[PDB]
Amino acid sequence: AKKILVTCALPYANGSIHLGHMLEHIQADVWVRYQRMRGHEVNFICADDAHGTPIMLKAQQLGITPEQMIGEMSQEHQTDFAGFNISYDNYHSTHSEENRQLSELIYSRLKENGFIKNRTISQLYDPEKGMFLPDRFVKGTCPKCKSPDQYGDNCEVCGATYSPTELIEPKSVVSGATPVMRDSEHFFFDLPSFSEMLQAWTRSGALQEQVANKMQEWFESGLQQWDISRDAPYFGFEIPNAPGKYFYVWLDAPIGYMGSFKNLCDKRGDSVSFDEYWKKDSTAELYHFIGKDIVYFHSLFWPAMLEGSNFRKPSNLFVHGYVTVNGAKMSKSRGTFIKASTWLNHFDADSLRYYYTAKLSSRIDDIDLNLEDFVQRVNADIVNKVVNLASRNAGFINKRFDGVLASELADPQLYKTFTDAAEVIGEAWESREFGKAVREIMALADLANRYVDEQAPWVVAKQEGRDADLQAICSMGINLFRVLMTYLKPVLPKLTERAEAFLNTELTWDGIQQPLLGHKVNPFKALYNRIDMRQVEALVEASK
Numbered sequence: 001a002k003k004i005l006v007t008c009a010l011p012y013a014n015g016s017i018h019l020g021h022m023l024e025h026i027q028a029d030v031w032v033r034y035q036r037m038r039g040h041e042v043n044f045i046c047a048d049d050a051h052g053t054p055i056m057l058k059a060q061q062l063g064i065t066p067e068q069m070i071g072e073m074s075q076e077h078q079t080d081f082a083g084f085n086i087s088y089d090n091y092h093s094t095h096s097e098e099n100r101q102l103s104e105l106i107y108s109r110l111k112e113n114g115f116i117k118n119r120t121i122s123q124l125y126d127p128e129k130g131m132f133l134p135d136r137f138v139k140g141t142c143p144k145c146k147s148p149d150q151y152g153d154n155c156e157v158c159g160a161t162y163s164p165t166e167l168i169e170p171k172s173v174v175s176g177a178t179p180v181m182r183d184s185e186h187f188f189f190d191l192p193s194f195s196e197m198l199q200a201w202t203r204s205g206a207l208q209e210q211v212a213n214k215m216q217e218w219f220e221s222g223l224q225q226w227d228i229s230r231d232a233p234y235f236g237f238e239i240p241n242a243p244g245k246y247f248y249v250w251l252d253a254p255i256g257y258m259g260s261f262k263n264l265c266d267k268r269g270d271s272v273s274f275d276e277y278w279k280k281d282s283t284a285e286l287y288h289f290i291g292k293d294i295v296y297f298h299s300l301f302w303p304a305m306l307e308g309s310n311f312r313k314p315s316n317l318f319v320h321g322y323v324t325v326n327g328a329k330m331s332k333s334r335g336t337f338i339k340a341s342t343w344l345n346h347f348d349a350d351s352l353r354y355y356y357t358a359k360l361s362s363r364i365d366d367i368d369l370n371l372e373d374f375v376q377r378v379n380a381d382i383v384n385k386v387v388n389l390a391s392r393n394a395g396f397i398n399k400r401f402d403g404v405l406a407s408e409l410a411d412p413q414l415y416k417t418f419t420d421a422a423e424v425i426g427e428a429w430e431s432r433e434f435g436k437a438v439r440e441i442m443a444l445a446d447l448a449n450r451y452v453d454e455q456a457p458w459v460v461a462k463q464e465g466r467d468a469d470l471q472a473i474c475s476m477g478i479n480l481f482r483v484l485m486t487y488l489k490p491v492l493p494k495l496t497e498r499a500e501a502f503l504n505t506e507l508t509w510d511g512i513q514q515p516l517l518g519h520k521v522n523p524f525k526a527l528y529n530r531i532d533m534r535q536v537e538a539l540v541e542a543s544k
């Protein structure tokens, strides 16, 4: 009966979805699907992060409007996520009217409350193009080793780091012009004002221990004010009362979580839910699934901005680690930098969903996709443990018993062992201990296959007068399958649909307390096929 708003980080609009994104969106989707199974009101919200200088420049290079460009990438992203069955209630954009109005509102409130500071800064400027240059749009000669054609604040030959103002013979990446230092007034959010509140949240015990520890490092270094403005030319929202100034993505990106929810409420004609979820007095829960690299932002800047503008703050942050492939960071040269779209040409979504889920936990630790292990694990667990219980038993039921399951459980004690596990497995899904949940489910699958082996239906089937025994054994196996697929429903949506078609019933969490007795099942082709290393080799080759 809880009200829950869950987000994933907003994908950047100038890059395709890859396996790293998928770790995050799959983790969130599994959790969301479980929460829905337990009867809660869930709103799963995301959007593309569509503003900024890189996006403006990319569109100019392509000779199209930034609006056309981000629209095309939004569609590409949503197609990929739909391919993996990520069950958003809304997927919006930071380039939207809802986000504009909320960004303006929040800024206005921050300013009225004394949290916006004005400061003049100096930055490299391209006088030919007529724009300030972000660091990575400045190139030149390393001041230390004198290597040419180095970009931004570091040299890829000697490893030195420096301000781009130290580059020798600097050039604009945009125009080739020599950049010069120029002053500009910027607006800053007074994050340090919120230090005590943030420190109290850190010690409150809600956050992951690893996150709280990192936060202590940040408090120790000392909180800084953060620039929330950019000069024209820009692709984004103009700041009221400040001609030629725009909101930097730091301000408008997370407000996209709010804008996406407002968009959903407005499309639904729901005039009460936005305030019910975002006002200070809210009894709804708000959760953000995010990666390591955006924790400072979500744990410090974001709750401060919300407090300073009279909105509720996150109930919790759920942080995951990086994805690796074959033990290492994704590598383009090795073909392990793998796009979501590419993945689906070779494998189904369920396979990756399962593999990631089996490795995930409540900690921040990197998650490794070892491709050899992926083949082994999917075949061993999905094909040979879980689906096996249906595939080894359904034929006899269909061919010899007209599709009808036995009128009573052959082994009620064993069935009770399976249903008794619901509390611990659900608690594991709830606490994000996904690996624990999968281990418990697979231990049950081992018990189920041990039961079938003990009963030896391939022997019973050939022996005169043992029809009743055969129906009993096979029906028991199918009932164990029903339970396991219920526990795995958040993980494997497509296999679940196929299982529900076979069983002639929707799988509900509470439904397992009533086994299927005197009940017609349907024939099926093949619920889940084996994979092989040849397919992996093809995936890698296609990714090079």
Ligand SMILES: [Zn+2]
Pocket (backbone or CB within 6 Å): 142, 143, 144, 145, 146, 147, 155, 156, 157, 158, 159, 160
């Ligand atoms: Zn160098």
